[PDB]
Write an enzyme that holds these catalytic residues in place. Structure first.
Site, PDB file in Angstrom:
ATOM      1  N   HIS A 150      19.945   3.495  -1.794  1.00  9.97           N
ATOM      2  CA  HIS A 150      19.731   2.362  -0.903  1.00  9.97           C
ATOM      3  C   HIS A 150      20.993   1.556  -0.630  1.00  9.97           C
ATOM      4  O   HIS A 150      20.905   0.394  -0.229  1.00  9.97           O
ATOM      5  CB  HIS A 150      18.624   1.446  -1.445  1.00  9.97           C
ATOM      6  CG  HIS A 150      17.289   2.110  -1.533  1.00  9.97           C
ATOM      7  ND1 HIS A 150      16.562   2.470  -0.422  1.00  9.97           N
ATOM      8  CD2 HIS A 150      16.547   2.494  -2.606  1.00  9.97           C
ATOM      9  CE1 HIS A 150      15.431   3.044  -0.796  1.00  9.97           C
ATOM     10  NE2 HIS A 150      15.402   3.067  -2.120  1.00  9.97           N
ATOM     11  N   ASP A 204      12.213   4.839 -11.475  1.00 10.36           N
ATOM     12  CA  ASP A 204      13.533   5.161 -10.940  1.00 10.36           C
ATOM     13  C   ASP A 204      14.323   3.948 -10.452  1.00 10.36           C
ATOM     14  O   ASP A 204      14.353   3.650  -9.256  1.00 10.36           O
ATOM     15  CB  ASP A 204      13.400   6.177  -9.809  1.00 10.36           C
ATOM     16  CG  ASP A 204      14.702   6.865  -9.482  1.00 10.36           C
ATOM     17  OD1 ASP A 204      15.778   6.341  -9.843  1.00 10.36           O
ATOM     18  OD2 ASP A 204      14.653   7.931  -8.831  1.00 10.36           O
ATOM     19  N   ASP A 234      14.869   6.985   1.405  1.00  8.75           N
ATOM     20  CA  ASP A 234      14.254   7.879   0.427  1.00  8.75           C
ATOM     21  C   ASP A 234      13.773   9.201   1.006  1.00  8.75           C
ATOM     22  O   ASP A 234      13.534  10.129   0.243  1.00  8.75           O
ATOM     23  CB  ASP A 234      13.054   7.216  -0.265  1.00  8.75           C
ATOM     24  CG  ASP A 234      13.444   6.079  -1.183  1.00  8.75           C
ATOM     25  OD1 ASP A 234      14.160   6.318  -2.181  1.00  8.75           O
ATOM     26  OD2 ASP A 234      12.986   4.947  -0.930  1.00  8.75           O
ATOM     27  N   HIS A 272     -27.102  15.041  14.423  1.00 10.28           N
ATOM     28  CA  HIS A 272     -28.558  15.032  14.614  1.00 10.28           C
ATOM     29  C   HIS A 272     -29.182  13.658  14.365  1.00 10.28           C
ATOM     30  O   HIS A 272     -30.404  13.519  14.344  1.00 10.28           O
ATOM     31  CB  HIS A 272     -29.255  16.103  13.758  1.00 10.28           C
ATOM     32  CG  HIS A 272     -28.617  17.456  13.844  1.00 10.28           C
ATOM     33  ND1 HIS A 272     -27.520  17.807  13.090  1.00 10.28           N
ATOM     34  CD2 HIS A 272     -28.910  18.538  14.600  1.00 10.28           C
ATOM     35  CE1 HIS A 272     -27.171  19.051  13.362  1.00 10.28           C
ATOM     36  NE2 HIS A 272     -27.995  19.517  14.281  1.00 10.28           N
ATOM     37  N   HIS A 299      18.281   5.253  -8.970  1.00 11.58           N
ATOM     38  CA  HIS A 299      18.576   5.663  -7.595  1.00 11.58           C
ATOM     39  C   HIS A 299      18.945   4.503  -6.672  1.00 11.58           C
ATOM     40  O   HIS A 299      19.567   4.719  -5.645  1.00 11.58           O
ATOM     41  CB  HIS A 299      17.418   6.471  -6.981  1.00 11.58           C
ATOM     42  CG  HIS A 299      16.374   5.631  -6.306  1.00 11.58           C
ATOM     43  ND1 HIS A 299      15.492   4.828  -7.001  1.00 11.58           N
ATOM     44  CD2 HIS A 299      16.060   5.485  -4.996  1.00 11.58           C
ATOM     45  CE1 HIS A 299      14.687   4.219  -6.147  1.00 11.58           C
ATOM     46  NE2 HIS A 299      15.012   4.598  -4.924  1.00 11.58           N
TER      47      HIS A 299
END
Ligand SMILES: c1ccc2c(c1)CCC2
Ligand SMILES: c1ccc2c(c1)CCC2
Ligand SMILES: c1ccc2c(c1)CCC2
Ligand code: FES
Ligand code: FES
Ligand code: FES
Ligand SMILES: [Fe+3]
Ligand SMILES: [Fe+3]
Ligand SMILES: [Fe+3]
Lengths: 446, 192, 192, 446, 192, 446
Positions: D213, D205, D362, D104, D208
């Site tokens: 990786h 982390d 990941d 509007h 990991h």
């Protein structure tokens, strides 16, 4: 959420909690208190004129079969087999004396009766009481000048009473014009909006037209075109707004008989409506003959909308809180030349159908307004519908209902949401009536 | 094709097959492929005015229908079988193009992204009118907007193309029978 | 195309159209189709080393951008318009290929399944460099893995190809402006 | 579920119920107790440097407009019109003095004020109180060295206090380097993981990296490459882990200034960081100058993560319990040569962007760990974060916070989840504080 | 291709590439494109009897497999690697065609809508059998029914075609290794 | 909904509320009271015959690893790492001595034991109690003639007792034939139906065959072909129906050894089954030898179904109330010639696999019947299973269980749903038993 206590719509319909467009628990509650309780559009005589003709339609999330009976009446039944619950009819329209289930072959009549069961004698003997196994029937089916509505609730007011003060405005086009036909089949598109977003827009939103539809107004050349980009406000007395006890309402734009139709149809339409208006002056008076050829943007509560003269006819079929299946038909006057009916029907779809360029202007508005109703910081926020509040009247000598005597305002939003809140907080029609005994007073306060 | 034997085949579809199974001109299929690839390129970059000027004939009928679902064995119910999602002449296409280009078309900001994939091109000259080229092709149309809205359209297109001003072949009829009855793409506001 | 009139068309897109609308060589479009079909076949069977050896030039720039959504009428905000999802030289492509082939790339077991659909091929020789071939094509790329993961990518590719060792035409530039702003495919770890 | 009583995170943060990654009711509860309560990343000065510049950002599931004011400050507002709730801004960035709604046509200033309403005089007269109709404003907006965060809760601690002990580690890179710039626009991808899965991974982390990786380490040649396939453990004193009262934490890998960047950037980066470190020794001392050029994997609670030196900057935007929209920016040091900034930004996206080959390693880890949280037999199972427990310290003479003096452990998980549980079980900041008055003691037990 | 170096490539896939990379006949790719486009047209209009008569050889093997997901490094587990979604001779195809055309096939009312997109066509004559034509192509198959059911299939097809009665080239083998392990399309009741 | 009180299945199993096919809260409740409580099909010896062989399988919505141990037994474990909950195994079948997690590299044995943790000495020292960190094991794993089932509930009856009276009917084909092999891999397709829709269809629905499968019967030429389009009812004594205490049941079509197999296999099969039947007469008696070569349509409660002789073997894996993942294997007799096994396996998939033309006839039936269970007007409606009620017997001298001595009826529906209701309203096996102490009396009333 406690629906008996929760204020979803504030006093006089002045605001609504944004969650109403997004809350799935409320959507489920609406299935009971809105869709299973109120009158819902099914079809038109013109789509099932002969004995055996049928269509399928949605009523809320339910699907029904709507069938012309041999005696000329129409009955509607849940599209669900009484045996193991398979969907009986998979098509949208046809002609048949009955429907056979593709699972175990049970055969139902057009009258819903269980007529045949394969190998009944060998399998069931005399133990199957077919008389108790008819399709689940829609309790109430009534007609408003060929337009057929259904209601699951036997306690509902008659359709005519339910239309309340809106009926007076619809009659010149629906009745005194000689009658309308619905041109099918409808366009069908899913939008990611709550059903209430388009319902509220059609019931009372003239404010949005110049801005939302700026591009459609500018490129189409329709008679409302002066509004494009808010370049020009309609003059005083350009129209009015109305609403009613059971929630139906509309805007009236005086004389706008060619509606949204592009310049290619304007002269022919303005000639046709004007000629019929001149005949109607003598039958129903100048004011009502003028209303006949005036553009009405209307919602028949809860989820059936229309633009008369433009000839747009909509069903906002609910799927979930942010999903709606939009059905779009064209309405035409029976006594229009056939070639004009055909071009009018195409023009309705051109502007407001699946590829309707006008309707497309509305998508983001309705989808995002609905989806924002789920967002954490907006659930408890207030959607505003206060424009024109304190200037509405009731019981006017000429125009009935709660009426705002201006073309642009939010009168019809307030009446729509007042009725909505009364239903959501009520367990039955008697409770709705008790909650609505001062409906017009509430709307005309201040 | 014999549609008494091939029970699922419509008379119209059988007629259209006949058109291409006969005379096959590899050069014509080449020209048709170029014509449709260029048209799709103009549309994809949203050069709608260029599309009208270079690809669309003044006598065009641009039609997309949606057919009501009926019983395969239905033979009595005879009311309107389809509606027109599009059924546009040149002026009506121009209106839609102006609507697209209008700077107050709010839905076009941010700018949409279109990608079209044209396949299965077939071409044959008409029997009666040696200037009328029939072209059949299928389209996948991908429209992306506003971060995460993605709509994909699928269709077969029955076209007629004819040489117009300058000897340029232009579209004089497009017919699409849209295969999905209920659209799940928000709208059909795309030029198929 | 006149981009003052065709308001929605970018200068870049108008430039690219001009390249193909002019001289049309059917034989070149043929060669281009073969080149892209063979490239897509090598990629689909995950012959990434063969792809590098046979399809990719030593001077390659392999680039896929994601453009920020801005107002159609925006004319003041001038910060970085896009980021590079890919912007790889040959050595960087080789790194990605080694990553794919590494037996400790756990995400590649069980083996992925790729299917590519190349359409809308256009080809034109460059004006200045008669050894540089411009090829445009669109890709649908389907990647399926792990039972029920399915990702479909859609894009237009602006390529430059040039004859390299042995006289074999190889990719020296690919540019993709990815049409979806927010990816709904888990990642864009596919060679478009 | 009763969030006042339910033990979702065990004492000392040692375990968490797997359902936390899958339960939609808990996700809805997190909207209130996590996202509406805590500081959330919006933008950087570098992205809205001039008056009128704006971006859109998510805060939880809400969307806000973040705008540079004429006085140089930044204010943020819900991207929702105060009239009927339509989304105001549909783009991601730009420059404007205001925002007009496409429904509007209401016009709002960059300062959130309702400035104009079409035909206000004719329609509303003097009855519309525009002063009360400004956009819903984000209560708190503060800067950490150009990085702009927002908070819906006026009761929150100042951003600096909220960073707690993590601030000390961030300052050498964020402040003493001369300042960072955020390079946009960000990559944006949806993953089918809970937001907590990547948040916990970036907060603490290191374990990991060698295994997850392995392929990225082996094929990229980065300086952390010795870790590939767990072929080699980092030596003792290779780094440490820290966590803080309000949940933010990070790992520190000493000297890792070239981070995940492939060999093509290693010499240039190691030269640049080393040179700046030599200047910083004299200003902030050897330890902090070393921290500047050390790789920090950090989460700023709840859902903003980063890898300093690598230059990866992440927002994990929540959609539902198994859906997260990942935004990836690059961070660069302002005084780096422009060509190096450009190559660094590309390398950030190459490794961790939408087609980041590291980030892809990941996906399955975060998606399946999240989705298993919905599975019946796993909902009540215990996710383990006990590595290094009983060896953390607090109040160390050199390194502040709760600190594990080893490169690989779960110290930062424990602090992240301790704060998470304290918020989920609390109704406001005062209750969080009461629940956190012995926070470091709980973390260093045994 | 050397599959010792290109670790992800199967022996079968490497064999198939070799077939097309060698002799390239542009005319054969033309014929193949026509053949597949006409086949897809017959299928799309549900002219299943015409498809059998004109496109399918009496000695046909029409096979679509679904391969079990196994470890990339798996070398001991040797049980059945795949099942046959289809493995049909001519008579078995005829049974399926009769099932489609039967007026008591309730699922075919209202009539289904098919749209097929054939791309990446490659063709080469067999070495040993100079009458056997190898054709490779990819298909996107769109099936729409009952208002809002939409299923899209994606596949690569390894075909052998041979001249049959009248000298008409007909399909004598189709092999598809379906790329999605768990179907998300309700069924695979389509002729790929 | 209160599952202790709610009558979802009426007395004697005569009807069920349609909501049972659509209600998501009930689906969640079934995870606990149906799937976590009962025996569920895992695999066959033939698919994991050697030490180290494994497959993955669903048990309800959970995924398990099912592994052949060195001692020749089979153990099953949740496919979820005990560290941070990542999915351990991403393939469907293979051979391994263990499974290594791709997140942080934890190594689990085929026996579920945590065997290795990367750098355990340096990181955990001696503090990690690996003995307590084995994969979550399926409590019960048992074999029925090579067919391996699992149960999460240690309190369950032995598999043989659980099969109850159904075992007697299965034994001639499963045991006395010399044994069956399961031919993998299975076809896998998602359908939009509740798992109970196909389960009920296979357990006791002969009524649907002539009508649903009219086209498949007419075009395939199988031995049941006379049924096409309900052209012919099977004669009296054409078969029977049975059901059992724990819900398993089946139909028996006498002599139908070639089953759904098209004419191309009929002579070979009818010869093979007849020849084996002649040998079995002397070993197990005429009636049971006849049962061996009779077509059994069976559901092993809750969600494992089969057609013996046709050789169709199904798992209806539940996803949500309107989503089921259908696994289809072929069963063959071990002593069949290999070429016949191969053609039989292909024919099973041809008729009932992912492109099974028979199975396709069922789609709309099962999908719409399930989806209608969500529709407002149908939730409280009654699905009927009264065919043959009042004519069932128990304790027959020849045929055990609750038996209807007719080929077509709803006996097996009633027993299926009686057991279903007893489980849904019970908290454990002891309560199920108490609720089932008059099970056959309830089924044979009137
Ligand atoms: C006037 C004209 C068009 C419309 C309205 C009013 C409401 C919706 C569309
Ligand atoms: C060191 C290096 C890279 C990363 C971490 C730590 C956590 C996430 C990614
Ligand atoms: C006889 C034959 C086939 C089938 C049944 C019974 C139940 C399902 C399929
Ligand atoms: S479900 Fe309709 S006849 Fe059985
Ligand atoms: S919704 Fe924004 S002006 Fe009305
Ligand atoms: S989640 Fe499996 S080792 Fe960490
Ligand atoms: Fe509108
Ligand atoms: Fe990682
Ligand atoms: Fe069946």
């Amino acid at each position: 959420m406690n629906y008996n206590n929760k204020i979803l719509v504030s006093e006089s319909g002045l605001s609504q909690k944004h969650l109403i467009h997004g809350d799935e628990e409320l959507f489920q509650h609406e299935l009971k208190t809105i869709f299973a309780r109120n009158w819902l559009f099914l079809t038109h005589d013109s789509l099932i004129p002969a004995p055996g003709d049928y269509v399928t339609a949605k009523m809320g999330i339910d699907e029904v079969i709507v069938s012309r009976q041999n005696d000329g009446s129409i009955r509607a039944f849940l599209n669900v087999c009484r045996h193991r619950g398979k969907t009986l009819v998979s098509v949208e329209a046809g002609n048949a004396k009955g429907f056979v289930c593709s699972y175990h072959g049970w055969g139902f009549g057009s009258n819903g009766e269980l007529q045949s069961v394969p190998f009944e004698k060998d399998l069931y003997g005399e133990s199957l009481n077919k008389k108790c196994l008819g399709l689940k029937e829609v309790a109430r089916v009534e007609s408003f000048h060929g337009f057929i509505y259904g209601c699951f609730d036997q306690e509902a007011p008659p359709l005519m009473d339910y239309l309340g003060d809106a009926a007076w405005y619809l009659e010149p086009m629906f009745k005194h014009s000689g009658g309308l036909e619905l041109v099918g089949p409808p366009g069908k598109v899913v939008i990611k909006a709550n059903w209430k977003a388009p319902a509220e827009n059609f019931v009372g939103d003239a404010y949005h037209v110049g801005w939302t539809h700026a591009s459609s107004l500018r490129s189409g050349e329709s008679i409302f075109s002066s509004l494009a980009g808010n370049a020009a406000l309609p003059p005083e007395g350009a129209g009015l707004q109305m609403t009613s006890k059971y929630g139906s309402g509309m805007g009236v734009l005086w004389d706008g008989y060619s509606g949204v139709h592009s310049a290619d149809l304007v002269p022919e339409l303005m000639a046709f409506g004007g000629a019929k208006q001149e005949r109607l002056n003598k039958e129903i008076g100048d004011v009502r003959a003028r209303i006949y050829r005036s553009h009405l943007n209307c919602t028949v509560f809860p989820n059936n909308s229309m633009l008369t003269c433009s000839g747009v006819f909509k069903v906002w079929n609910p799927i979930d809180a942010n999903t709606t299946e939009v059905w779009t038909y064209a309405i035409v006057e029976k006594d229009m030349p056939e070639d004009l009916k055909r071009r009018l029907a195409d023009s309705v779809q051109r502007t407001f159908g699946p590829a309707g360029f006008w309707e497309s202007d509305d998508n983001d508005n309705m989808e995002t307004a609905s989806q924002n109703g789920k967002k954490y910081q907006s659930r408890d926020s207030d959607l505003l519908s206060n424009l024109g509040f304190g200037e509405d009247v009731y019981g006017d000598a000429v125009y009935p209902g709660v009426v705002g005597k201006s073309a642009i305002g939010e009168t019809s939003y307030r009446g729509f949401y007042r009725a909505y809140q009364a239903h959501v907080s009520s367990s039955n029609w008697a409770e709705f009536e008790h909650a609505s005994s001062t409906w017009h007073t509430e709307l005309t306060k201040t | 094709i014999n549609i008494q034997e091939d029970k699922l085949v419509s008379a119209h579809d059988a007629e259209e097959i006949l058109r291409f199974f006969n005379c096959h001109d590899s050069a014509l299929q080449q020209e048709a492929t170029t014509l449709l690839t260029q048209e799709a390129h103009l549309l994809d970059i949203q050069a709608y005015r260029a599309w009208l000027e270079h690809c669309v004939g003044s006598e065009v009928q641009y039609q997309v229908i949606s057919r009501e679902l009926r019983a395969a064995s239905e033979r009595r119910y005879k009311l309107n079988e389809a509606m027109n999602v599009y059924n546009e002449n040149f002026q009506q296409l121009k209106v839609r193009v102006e609507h697209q280009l209008d700077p107050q078309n709010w839905g076009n900001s941010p700018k949409l992204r279109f990608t079209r994939f044209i396949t299965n091109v077939q071409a044959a000259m008409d029997v009666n009118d040696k200037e009328l080229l029939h072209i059949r092709s299928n389209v996948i149309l991908h429209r992306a907007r506003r971060g995460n809205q993605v709509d994909v359209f699928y269709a077969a297109r029955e076209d007629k193309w004819k040489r117009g001003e300058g000897g340029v072949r232009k579209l004089v009829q497009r017919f699409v029978d849209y295969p999905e009855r209920i659209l799940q793409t928000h709208n059909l506001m795309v030029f198929l």
